[PDB]
């Protein structure tokens, strides 16, 4: 597949999907999807969520010029705001002269969180479950086969104490689960259910609360890219000086948070409109991107941006990116379906991996704005 | 208007739509927008982003039964995932017996930032900007006379230094700018670019950025609500229980950042899809939303819960509201239009008001639900 799409951007809307159906090889029910409007029918739409009294479109893009590991790939994007489908084709297309995106990922662990109350003495608790791990971990193990043999499933558990709270001495256990190609809410949660009376005889307290952590900092994805001065020379500036006033606009994120919320919004920017577009929760994304962000101490760049030994501008993304191929949305909705086929993603895994890539360029493209732009 | 809409969620989407029309007194075409597919259409939408080849929908709803500031109101909301508008709404149900939220704001206030770099005198720059402040606040001013008129403008400045980074001295100028019905980016980016040429001229250095902030922590918006034990009472528990588990669930987001993500995430369930329906940049409130969580260094709850001196519950959120009823795609949409049709905000303060009711209401419900499972 290419993904250059030259000319794409000053296509009518029909000439540009028909350019999308023949690079794919679409079928017919596929293009006309996006042909006629309501894609999504009522008794979907109704279905989906409560008290439903129509639909609310938003306009549906695609993304030019990405790569990944080698691999051209065509991006599905729903949002509002201008100049965001631009910049990341650019970036991208920058991108491409350099061997386009690099990327990789953790296996798809999220966390259930098991909270324990009740308990006069939660630190001599927390060694009894660990002593009793195995145990557990079995447990949660039991009913989903079906994940087991898929390559998932309850891989550990940590127990994590706050002895001295305003409201007494509270357990908290994380149920670390792979997940496979789901977000990861339904399953955790399950087995955060089925292990809770396991624990509470073990700890002798009571469980509260039995839930996923939004803070998915164990299913992490990881994109690079790398441009040279030459690409970023302008009309003003060279390329040399446009890499460093970016390096400027870094550093800059990284100490000052009214910037960093700033320039991350931007990379949100990119992979926001992929979650939608996806039919997945960007609610859950945006929270433990953000959480993510002030792991610190201190509300920082989700991306880095460095010179090279070379003199080459090279950016990075690492972050939580927990999405699903499967689940709600992402199956029930057919242009949700559309886009994983526009896609071409086989995990959840690799869906993680073009969205931190679209959000590493995305932030690129905001930053390189900002720096060339002459002073008025 | 009363919003309590009994068996609304069991009409189909026709009878919901002819109910709120009737309402609402809408008119026979605006109910058409909502009743065929196809209200944004594809000239608008192809518009309004860079490489559109069609339209995505989600589908739009309205929660019942909430009331703000002793008024109902119905709150549309564009989402996928289930349980969001059901929860808001039996939150805001028992909200009502009790008053419904009560609910404030800061002015729309925003701020631009100017980095500028390349002094050796960070320092002292910083005190020729202030020097000066009342030149450079006309400066912005002057570039957006139609902004001051409707009762806006740029209203102060504040400048805040970096003497030591690894890319050296830097300073950066805040204005702080009353934005009115603005989200306010293209606002207040305008007028950063506008006293950027006299900022170099005061500090002798160079200017880099200049752009809005979306940690608005000037632009708050400010939700109570109260519920009583009678009304969290359930087969399995007391009322009071419930309230004492909800506390503990509060005390331990507090301290918990892996669960003070989930709980805060809950509360913007609530939110964003209001952000969604009204066409305002949801990435920007969510942004300002979970940067304001960490202020302190330590990310935590962005709602507060606590009993009264009457045993009651009573929940608050403050936090960065920046919204439009002008501006990006809020006009742009006809959906968007409606959409502020039938919540009958006058201001974007008042949005934000009713975003910050709709988020104390979900968060409420989230708990609620984990305290008696």
Not at 323 to 329: E, K, N
Request: glycine fraction near 8%; include cysteine; charge should be negative.
């Amino acid at each position: 597949l290419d993904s250059r799409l030259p000319a794409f951007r000053n296509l009518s809307p029909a000439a540009r999907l028909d350019h999308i159906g023949q690079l794919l090889g679409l079928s017919h029910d596929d293009v006309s999807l996006l042909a006629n409007a309501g894609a999504l029918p009522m008794d979907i739409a109704n279905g989906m969520i409560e008290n439903v009294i129509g639909t609310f479109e938003l306009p549906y893009a695609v993304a030019s010029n990405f790569q990944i590991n080698g691999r051209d790939v065509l991006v599905p994007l729903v949002v509002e705001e201008p100049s965001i489908v631009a910049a990341a084709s650019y970036m991208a297309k920058l991108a491409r002269a350099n061997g386009g995106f690099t990327t990789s990922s953790s296996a798809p662990l999220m966390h259930a969180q098991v909270q324990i109350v009740g308990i006069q003495d939660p630190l001599n608790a927390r060694l009894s479950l660990l002593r009793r791990k195995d145990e557990i971990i079995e447990l949660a193990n039991r009913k989903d086969q079906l994940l087991n043999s898929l390559g998932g499933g309850c891989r550990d558990i940590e127990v994590h104490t706050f002895a001295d709270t305003p409201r007494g001495p509270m357990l908290v256990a994380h149920l670390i689960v792979d997940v496979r190609d789901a977000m990861g809410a339904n399953t955790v949660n399950t087995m955060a259910e089925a292990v809770a009376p396991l624990m509470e005889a073990i700890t002798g307290g009571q469980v509260r609360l039995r839930i996923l952590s939004n803070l998915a900092d164990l299913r992490l994805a990881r994109a690079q890219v790398r441009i040279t001065p030459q690409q970023l020379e302008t009309a003003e500036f060279s390329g040399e000086a446009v890499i460093e006033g970016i390096l400027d606009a870094y550093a800059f994120a990284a100490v000052d948070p009214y910037r960093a919320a700033t320039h991350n919004k931007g990379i949100m920017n990119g992979i926001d409109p992929l979650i939608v577009a996806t039919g997945n929760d960007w609610r859950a994304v945006e929270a433990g991107a953000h959480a993510y962000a002030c792991r610190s101490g201190h509300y920082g760049s989700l991306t880095t941006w460095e010179k090279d030994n070379n003199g080459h501008l090279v950016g990075t993304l690492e972050m939580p990116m927990p999405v699903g191929l499967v689940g709600g949305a992402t199956k029930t909705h057919p242009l949700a379906q559309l886009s994983l086929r526009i896609l071409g993603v086989k995990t959840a895994q690799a869906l993680a991996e073009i969205a931190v890539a679209v959000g590493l360029a995305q932030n690129l493209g905001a930053m390189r704005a900002l720096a060339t732009e002459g002073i008025q």
